[PDB]
Amino acid sequence: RPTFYRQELNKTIWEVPERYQNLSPVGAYGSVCAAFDTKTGLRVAVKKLSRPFQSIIHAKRTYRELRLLKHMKHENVIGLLDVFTPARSLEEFNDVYLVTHLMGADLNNIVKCQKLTDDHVQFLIYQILRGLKYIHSADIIHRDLKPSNLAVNEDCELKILDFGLARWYRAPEIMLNWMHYNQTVDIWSVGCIMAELLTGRTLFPGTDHIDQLKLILRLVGTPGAELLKKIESARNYIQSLTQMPKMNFANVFIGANPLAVDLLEKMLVLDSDKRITAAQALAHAYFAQYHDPDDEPVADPYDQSFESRDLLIDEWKSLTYDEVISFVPPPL
Ligand SMILES: O=C(NCCN1CCOCC1)c1ccc2c(c1)C(=O)c1ccc(Nc3cc(NC(=O)c4cccs4)c(F)cc3F)cc1CC2
């Protein structure tokens, strides 16, 4: 059992093994510190979960997070190097820390509001879709996919952060509080991101809920009256926006690769029943230089029966504890 040390960073106490040195904040469900692991010689990210067992929602989410990370192994999914707690025993177990490879940037820090070239975008969105294909094939959704959830390293290798745990990138169906969501809620988010990297600008930077909905409804293809039927007097305020003469969608992305523009139109569709999926997006002509089906895996079957249990904080806590105790680091 390692020796721990305490310190206060950004008004929160970090208690970590001595192997982790030079804790330095880098900005959910936790705060993250960059650090240097003296035992492996790797630069690392350490995530401190915020109040992991101080509500049922948190307890179950903490367990979900540990389960997901011990199950997934994928290039575009963050890989758990260590998980630890200061606690000497179960009755003492109140904090969880997860260690991964430091990536060193999120996607906002790469796109400092400048257009990216087409190859740079293909590679970035390719990897996001590859990651989603894997994640989706485990019956898991991100639900809040945005640039701050995408870690990117100096070689442009990308990792999807914080998937499976749960406004500019959010599918409209979600902000309309539909109940029946499918996995394409994340493809909507992909379109928003993708668009943003092509133009330098956020596609729908709404300052509030109504603005956001209007910026979307007026730019994006208007559905058939059928779909405005699947929805109070919101139908009227919505119908009033969607009935108005539109601008050509592709004209927003003038000069972009026309295959890029075509894939966007398949992604930014309101009718989630007609949004392209991850797997289909990967087979778009846009990704011809990158697509390889022998290297776009699906996930191992993943036991999520815990999702339909309803337990108390201490039960969720015990099960997480067993997962911390039995964690085995990857070799290297
Ligand atoms: O190195 C960075 N520096 C920022 C600024 N520096 C400040 C110090 O001085 C120099 C400049 C930096 C800036 C931004 C980011 C990272 C690093 C990063 O590698 C990084 C790494 C990991 C991470 N989250 C994280 C998620 C998870 N978990 C998950 O993603 C998942 C949970 C469930 C399913 S996936 C985890 F276990 C451990 C984690 F650390 C979050 C980030 C945040 C993005």
Q: What CATH class does 105-298 carry?
A: mainly alpha
Give the method used.
Answer: X-ray
Radius of gyration of the chain from its Cα atoms, rounded to whole angstroms: 21
Distances (CA, A) of 143 to 59, 241, 298: 19, 26, 19
Q: Are strands 20-25 and 30-37 parallel, antiparallel or unpaired?
A: antiparallel
User: d(Cα 6, Cα 8) in Å, to the nearest integer?
Assistant: 7
Cα–ligand 1 centroid distance for 107 (angstroms): 11
Residue 125 beta carbon below 6 angstroms from any ligand 1 atom? no
CA 315/CA 321 separation, integer angstroms: 10
Closest CA to 60 of 303, 302, 308, 301: 308
**C-beta 161 within 6 A of ligand 1:** yes
Q: Which residue shows structure tokens 């089906």?
A: 293
Ligand 1 centre distance from Cα of residue 109 (Å): 12
162 is catalytic: yes
How would DSSP label each residue in 238-282?
Answer: HHHHHTSPPPPSGGGGTTS-HHHHHHHHHHS-S-TTSS--HHHHH
Largest CA distance in the chain: 67
16, β-bridge pairs: 5
Among candidate residues 231, 263, 241, the one with its CA nearest the CA of residue 250: 263
Rounded CA-CA distance 181/171 in Å is: 10
Q: Tell me how far CA of residue 102 lies from CA of 37, 95, 219, in angstroms.
A: 11, 21, 38
Q: Mind giving me the DSSP string for 127-155?
A: HHHHHHHHHHTTT---SS--GGGEEE-TT
What whole-number distance in Å separates Cα of residue 54 and Cα of residue 33?
Answer: 22
Q: How far is CA 110 from CA 10, 30, 91, 151, 152, in A?
A: 25, 22, 43, 10, 8
Contact (Cβ atoms closer than 8 angstroms) between residue 209 and residue 182: no
Pocket test for ligand 1, best of 14, 24, 32 (most atoms within 8 A of CB): 32
Q: Phi/psi of residue 323, each to 5°?
A: -70, -35
- Out of 46, 76, 100, 112, give the residue to mutate to test ligand 1, the one with the largest number of ligand atoms within 8 Å of its CB: 100
* Cα-to-centroid distance, 309 and ligand 1 (Å): 30
Helix axes 56-71, 313-325, angle to 10 degrees: 30
Residue 143 structure tokens: 């639900």
How far is 208 from 27, CA to CA, in rounded Å? 24
What the block records as the tokens of 210 is 């109504």
**84 C-alpha to ligand 1 centroid (Å):** 17
In angstroms, rounded to a whole number, what is the distance separating the alpha carbons of residues 330 and 323? Answer: 15
3-state DSSP assignment of residue 291: coil
Helix, strand or coil for residue 7?
strand
Helix pair angle (185-199, 118-136), 10° resolution? 170
Query: What CA–CA distance (Å, rounded) separates 169 from 143?
Result: 10
Cα 309 from Cα 18, distance rounded (Å): 37
Q: What share of the chain is helix, strand, coil (3-state, %, to 5)?
A: 40, 15, 45
Domain boundaries, the chain: 14-104, 105-298
CA distances from 11 to 50, 117, 173 (A): 12, 40, 37
DSSP H or E stretch at residue 17: strand 12-17
User: Which residue type does 270 have?
Assistant: L
Instruction: Note the CATH architecture for domain 14-104.
Output: 2-Layer Sandwich (3.30)
Options 37, 106, 144, 162, the catalytic residue? 162
Q: Annotated binding site for ATP, which residues?
A: 26-32, 47
**DSSP readout, 163-183?**
TT---TT--HHHHTT-S---T
Q: What's the CA angle centered on 229, arms 226 and 232, to 5 degrees?
A: 160
Q: DSSP letter at 31?
A: E
Which 8-state DSSP code applies to residue 320?
A: H
Helix and strand element counts for the chain (H, E): 11, 9
Note whether 80 and 327 are within 8 A (CB).
Answer: yes
